[PDB]
DNA sequence: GCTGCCGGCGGCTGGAGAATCCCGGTGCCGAGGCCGCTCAATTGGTCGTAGACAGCTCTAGCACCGCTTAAACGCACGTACGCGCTGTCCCCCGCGTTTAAACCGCCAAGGGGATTACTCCCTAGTCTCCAGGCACGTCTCAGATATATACATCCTG
DNA sequence: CAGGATGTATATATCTGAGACGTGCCTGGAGACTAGGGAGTAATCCCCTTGGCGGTTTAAACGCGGGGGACAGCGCGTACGTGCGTTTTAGCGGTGCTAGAGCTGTCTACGACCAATTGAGCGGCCTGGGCACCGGGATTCTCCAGCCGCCGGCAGC
C-alpha cells in the first residue's frame, strides 16, 4: 500500500530512518528501540534549531543574510550555557569573542 | 640568508599578532623563542597521532580526517572539516 | 561521479527555513553544523550505549537517550530537549 | 617645527588588539607553517604528503590553542601585578593547564 | 623566658610531616551529613552506600589538594608566601571549570 | 519523627584547622582568613556536579540506592576517574 | 550465587613472577583491578573507533598495536608494542 | 581433545579467552580478530608488571613487604613517563609526594 | 607687612591619523529544477530481552555513652602584606628596505578510490573439561605501641 | 660570631591482631571439533589532487633609533597569621536495633529482527540570477598636545 516517511509521523523534519540506520550500524548496542531514533532526532533538531537561531540573530546584528562560521562562533561563545557545552571545541573560521582586560586600559 | 630552520618561519610579528588576538598588550623579549618551543611541542604531539592514523589507513596521504581525529583524541575537537 | 556521500545539509536547511525563513547559510557554516550535529549525535549515542552496558541491558530505547541527554546537556537545554523528545515520541506513537 | 605625530606607547597595541579580535583570518602565513609542519613530520614518515584541508585545519587548531594559551598567560600576568608577560608566566600557565606536568 | 618556635618553623614541620601521610584529611560524619544535605536538593528519599561516601570524600580531598597546589604555585609566582582568594579564582579559571 | 530529616548549615563543618591541614598537604607555608569560604564554595560546586550525575545514573537504574559504582562512574565521566572502588 | 569477575589472580601471578617475596593489600589489589579495567576499556574503545573510521567491521592485532602507539607515551608505547608483537607471533606459531 | 588455554599458547599470564569475550560482548565491532585479544593481554601484562616493579622498589625502599596505595602513588608520580598516562587518574588513599617549594624553606 | 615672582593645574580647543560608512559596479555560487538509485517503508511472520510477580536476605539508617581529640578563642608578636621612591633599561613605535608570501599558470605523477573473485579468517552450534570465584580457615607476619636516645633550634655569652 | 637546653624526631622490645595466602567445591566459561559465509585482500584501472616549476608584486618582516614607563630593589607602616595556652565541643566507636529494597528466579509477552517488494528522498548535476566584495571617498572618532587664567606658595618688606 501507500508508504510514508517516519519523520512525517514523528513530527520532526530531521530523519528517522537515517538515525535508525546510524544507530544500527554504529556499533553502540546489540539492539535499539523504535522510539529511540525518534527521540534522538528530536533532541538533535532542537539543538540545531537553537544554535541556528542564535547564529542568525548575530547575523542580523552584523547585517548579513547568510550565516558565516564567525556568527556560529559568536553564538556559541556568547551563550554561557552553550559555551559550557562546547567548551573544548575549536571552531572553523570563527575567531574569538572580543574582550580586553580592564587593567590594561589607560587611566581615562 | 636562504637556509633557515622551518621553526623560525613562525616570525616575531606573527606570534605578536597571535598574542594581540589573545588580548595581551605588552610582551617581553624572552617570550618568542619559548613560545616557539611550546608551539612546536604541540605540533609534534598532534602530528604523531595524525601520522599514526595515516599509517593505519595504509595510505601515504594525510587527509583532514586523520588530523581532526587526532585533535579530538588529544582533547581539542574541531568543526567544519568533515566530522 | 559515484559513491554519493551522506550529510545533514537538507535537514539543517529545512530547520533554518522554520527558524529564519529569509536567512541563508554559508557552505563552511553548513560543514560546521554538519560536523557539530554528527559529534553531538556520536556523543549522545555513546553515552546511551555506555549506560545500556552499565545496567546490563542490550537494547537502546527512548529512556536510555533521555537519561543521556539529561546527563550531557546542562541548564535549560536538558529540560527543553527532554520535553521535545517526549512530545516527538508521543506524536510518533499516536499515529503509527 | 612640529614634532612628528606619534601614538603613546601602548595604544596602537590596543587598537590592533581590537582589530584582530573581530577578525577570523589566519594569523599565520600559509607557506612558513606548511614548511614547519613538513619539516617536523618528515621524521615520523619520510617523504610524507599532506592535504591542503588537513594542513589548514592543523594550522588553525594550532592558532586556536596558542591564542587560548596566550589569553591565559595574560590573565596570569595581570594577576601577578604586572602587564608584561614573562617566561615564568607562560610556564606557570602551561603547568596549571595540565599539558606540561 | 619561654621557648617559642619561629613563625613558620612549626608550619614547615607540618608541611614536611603531613605530606608523607595518606589517610583521609577531614572528619567523616561532616562529609556524610554534607553529602546527604546536597543530595537532598537534587532528589529526596535517597539511600547511600558507604563505599560511595568514601569515594566522594577521597575525590574531594584529592581535588582540593591539587587546587591548593595550584594556588600555592600562583602565590609563590606572585612574589609572596601566603595565599589569597585571587589565587583560587585564577587556578579555577585556567583549569576551565568556570570558563 | 520517622523520616524527612532536612539538614542545613553543614558546609561550615569543615573547620579552619581542617583547611589548614588540607593546604599543608597541598604544601603551603601560610594562609589567609579569606580562603575558608571560597574553598567551601568550590567544595559545594564539585559535589553538586558529582551527585547530580550520580542520581541521574541511579534514576536510570530504576533504583534508589546509590552504589559506589554510580559515584566512581560519574567521576570518570567528569574526566577525574578514581581508582580503588571497583572501577 | 552470581559468580563475580576480577583480574585478581593475574596481577597476583605477575607480582609473584617479578617479586617472589612481596605481597599486595586488598585495597591496592582493587586499585590494580581498576587500572587494568580502565586501560582495557581505553584500548578497546580506541580500537573500535579506529575500525569505524577505516570502515572496518573487525578488530585485529593491528588496531590494538596502533592504539598502543598513539595512547601511551614513548617508551611505554614502544615496549608494549614489542611485547604484544612477540606474544602474537608466539601464539600464531602454534595456534 | 587435549584442551589448552590461549594464554598458555601465547605464553601470557592474562586470560586471552576472557579478553576476547569482553571484546565480543563490549559492542566494539561486529567481528574480532584472533590476535587482538593476545595483543591486549600482552600490553596489559606489560603495564601491570611495569607499575609492579615500581611499587616493589618503593616498598623495599620503605622497608615493607606489602603493597599499599601509598607505594602505588609514590611509584607512579616519580617517573614522568607513567605520569603522562596516569596524570589524570587519582587512586584511593593516594596522597601526594613530599615536595616543598624552595622559597618556603628557611634562610639556611 | 603687601609686592613681585614663580611654578603647577587642569581645562580647553585644535591638529592629526585611523576607523567607519555609502555607492558602485563586479565577481562568485548558495539556491533551485531533474533523474534515477539507494535506501527507507511495509506487510508477514519469530523469538527472546525486559518487564511483572514472588519472595530473601544483605545491607542501610540510628542512638548512646565514655573519652579523647581535636576544635575554638584570645593573645603578642615578628613577619610578610602592600605600598611609596627611585632608577634603569628594555620594550614600544615609526621608518627604510630587504624578502619571502602568494597567486598566477601548467604540468607529472604517486596515489586515492570504485569493482572484481574469492578465501579463508572469522562466526555459529554442541560437547567437553577445568580455571577461577567463593566460603572458610587460619597462622601469621604485618602493624602498634610505650620505651631509650639524635637533632637542630633558638637563643646565650 | 661559637656552644647549651630543649620540643621535635629517630630506633625498638614486646603485644597483638585483621587478613594475605592457601584449599576444597563446583560450575559456568573456555576451548576443541565441524558447516558456512561474507570481509577483507590483492588485482585492476581511472581520475585527481598534490608536489613541483618559475615571474610578478607587494605586503611584510627585519634591523635600527629614540624614549618612556614598567619593573624590580630598598625601605617602611601595619595588620595579622602563627605558635601556644586554655577551655569545650563534636567526632570515634562498639553496641544492639530496626526495617528497605536490591537481588535472584520464573512466567510471559511484545517489540525488535529479519525478509521480499516497491516506490520516493535526495545526492548529484547543472544553471541564472541574486548576494558578498573592492575602491574611492566622505564622515566620524579618538588621541595627544600646547595656551593660559586660576591657584598655591615664595622670597623680601
mmCIF file of C-alpha atoms in Angstrom, chain E residues 8 11-12 14-15 18-19 21-23 25-27 29-31 33-35 37-39 42-43 45-49 51-52 54-56 58-61 63-65 67-69 72 81-85 88 92 97, chain F residues 5 7-11 13-14 18-32 34-35 38-39 42-52 55 58-59 64-68 71-72 75 80 82-83 85:
data_model
loop_
_atom_site.group_PDB
_atom_site.id
_atom_site.type_symbol
_atom_site.label_atom_id
_atom_site.label_comp_id
_atom_site.label_asym_id
_atom_site.label_seq_id
_atom_site.Cartn_x
_atom_site.Cartn_y
_atom_site.Cartn_z
ATOM 1 C CA UNK E 8 56.871 29.201 60.320
ATOM 2 C CA UNK E 11 54.430 25.442 59.727
ATOM 3 C CA UNK E 12 57.359 23.841 57.899
ATOM 4 C CA UNK E 14 53.591 20.382 59.442
ATOM 5 C CA UNK E 15 54.326 20.600 55.709
ATOM 6 C CA UNK E 18 51.630 15.637 56.987
ATOM 7 C CA UNK E 19 52.597 15.389 53.300
ATOM 8 C CA UNK E 21 50.729 10.654 55.324
ATOM 9 C CA UNK E 22 47.962 9.131 53.216
ATOM 10 C CA UNK E 23 44.868 8.860 55.434
ATOM 11 C CA UNK E 25 42.249 14.626 55.868
ATOM 12 C CA UNK E 26 38.948 15.622 57.398
ATOM 13 C CA UNK E 27 36.444 14.015 59.779
ATOM 14 C CA UNK E 29 30.454 12.468 59.551
ATOM 15 C CA UNK E 30 30.931 16.052 58.281
ATOM 16 C CA UNK E 31 31.145 14.792 54.681
ATOM 17 C CA UNK E 33 25.964 14.898 56.523
ATOM 18 C CA UNK E 34 27.110 17.353 53.837
ATOM 19 C CA UNK E 35 26.689 14.836 51.008
ATOM 20 C CA UNK E 37 22.288 17.513 52.554
ATOM 21 C CA UNK E 38 23.324 18.317 48.982
ATOM 22 C CA UNK E 39 21.817 15.109 47.558
ATOM 23 C CA UNK E 42 18.533 17.069 43.666
ATOM 24 C CA UNK E 43 16.182 14.280 44.718
ATOM 25 C CA UNK E 45 14.422 9.891 49.673
ATOM 26 C CA UNK E 46 17.862 8.606 48.740
ATOM 27 C CA UNK E 47 19.947 5.725 50.049
ATOM 28 C CA UNK E 48 23.735 5.923 50.093
ATOM 29 C CA UNK E 49 26.346 3.177 50.153
ATOM 30 C CA UNK E 51 31.804 2.939 49.683
ATOM 31 C CA UNK E 52 30.141 5.735 47.700
ATOM 32 C CA UNK E 54 34.302 7.140 50.962
ATOM 33 C CA UNK E 55 34.770 7.632 47.214
ATOM 34 C CA UNK E 56 33.188 11.094 47.315
ATOM 35 C CA UNK E 58 38.562 10.885 48.677
ATOM 36 C CA UNK E 59 37.711 12.549 45.358
ATOM 37 C CA UNK E 60 37.009 15.890 47.021
ATOM 38 C CA UNK E 61 40.151 15.578 49.136
ATOM 39 C CA UNK E 63 40.603 17.790 44.155
ATOM 40 C CA UNK E 64 41.352 20.342 46.870
ATOM 41 C CA UNK E 65 44.896 19.040 47.376
ATOM 42 C CA UNK E 67 43.780 23.026 43.887
ATOM 43 C CA UNK E 68 45.888 24.155 46.843
ATOM 44 C CA UNK E 69 48.963 23.023 44.926
ATOM 45 C CA UNK E 72 50.422 27.822 46.281
ATOM 46 C CA UNK E 81 54.212 33.105 50.573
ATOM 47 C CA UNK E 82 50.596 33.469 51.790
ATOM 48 C CA UNK E 83 47.631 32.603 49.585
ATOM 49 C CA UNK E 84 44.662 34.805 48.701
ATOM 50 C CA UNK E 85 41.241 34.384 47.048
ATOM 51 C CA UNK E 88 41.959 30.192 43.824
ATOM 52 C CA UNK E 92 39.890 27.638 38.633
ATOM 53 C CA UNK E 97 35.502 24.564 35.291
ATOM 54 C CA UNK F 5 15.394 14.978 58.348
ATOM 55 C CA UNK F 7 19.637 19.443 57.241
ATOM 56 C CA UNK F 8 21.049 22.950 56.890
ATOM 57 C CA UNK F 9 24.282 24.793 57.705
ATOM 58 C CA UNK F 10 26.608 21.827 57.206
ATOM 59 C CA UNK F 11 29.235 23.361 54.910
ATOM 60 C CA UNK F 13 31.527 21.904 59.499
ATOM 61 C CA UNK F 14 34.817 21.959 57.602
ATOM 62 C CA UNK F 18 40.778 21.336 58.556
ATOM 63 C CA UNK F 19 41.528 23.630 55.607
ATOM 64 C CA UNK F 20 44.889 24.403 57.209
ATOM 65 C CA UNK F 21 45.776 20.700 57.222
ATOM 66 C CA UNK F 22 44.443 20.280 53.676
ATOM 67 C CA UNK F 23 46.637 23.128 52.435
ATOM 68 C CA UNK F 24 49.636 21.829 54.387
ATOM 69 C CA UNK F 25 49.144 18.615 52.431
ATOM 70 C CA UNK F 26 48.901 20.846 49.370
ATOM 71 C CA UNK F 27 52.166 22.341 50.576
ATOM 72 C CA UNK F 28 51.579 25.934 51.675
ATOM 73 C CA UNK F 29 53.587 27.849 54.252
ATOM 74 C CA UNK F 30 50.938 30.413 55.230
ATOM 75 C CA UNK F 31 47.209 31.041 54.838
ATOM 76 C CA UNK F 32 44.652 33.848 54.884
ATOM 77 C CA UNK F 34 39.682 34.558 53.365
ATOM 78 C CA UNK F 35 40.014 31.192 51.614
ATOM 79 C CA UNK F 38 35.699 30.024 48.656
ATOM 80 C CA UNK F 39 37.181 26.578 49.310
ATOM 81 C CA UNK F 42 34.327 25.050 45.354
ATOM 82 C CA UNK F 43 33.507 22.078 47.569
ATOM 83 C CA UNK F 44 29.761 22.584 47.135
ATOM 84 C CA UNK F 45 30.089 23.179 43.404
ATOM 85 C CA UNK F 46 32.138 19.986 42.994
ATOM 86 C CA UNK F 47 29.647 17.878 44.929
ATOM 87 C CA UNK F 48 26.616 19.135 43.040
ATOM 88 C CA UNK F 49 28.299 18.173 39.781
ATOM 89 C CA UNK F 50 29.172 14.715 41.135
ATOM 90 C CA UNK F 51 25.935 13.678 42.842
ATOM 91 C CA UNK F 52 23.792 15.284 40.125
ATOM 92 C CA UNK F 55 21.422 10.439 40.962
ATOM 93 C CA UNK F 58 20.540 5.867 39.893
ATOM 94 C CA UNK F 59 17.237 7.094 38.449
ATOM 95 C CA UNK F 64 17.014 4.396 44.907
ATOM 96 C CA UNK F 65 20.244 3.111 46.462
ATOM 97 C CA UNK F 66 23.330 4.959 45.210
ATOM 98 C CA UNK F 67 26.172 2.449 44.968
ATOM 99 C CA UNK F 68 29.850 3.369 44.759
ATOM 100 C CA UNK F 71 29.840 7.879 42.142
ATOM 101 C CA UNK F 72 33.046 6.498 40.624
ATOM 102 C CA UNK F 75 33.660 10.776 38.447
ATOM 103 C CA UNK F 80 38.596 12.760 37.019
ATOM 104 C CA UNK F 82 39.021 7.367 40.571
ATOM 105 C CA UNK F 83 40.834 4.104 41.298
ATOM 106 C CA UNK F 85 36.245 1.444 44.208
#
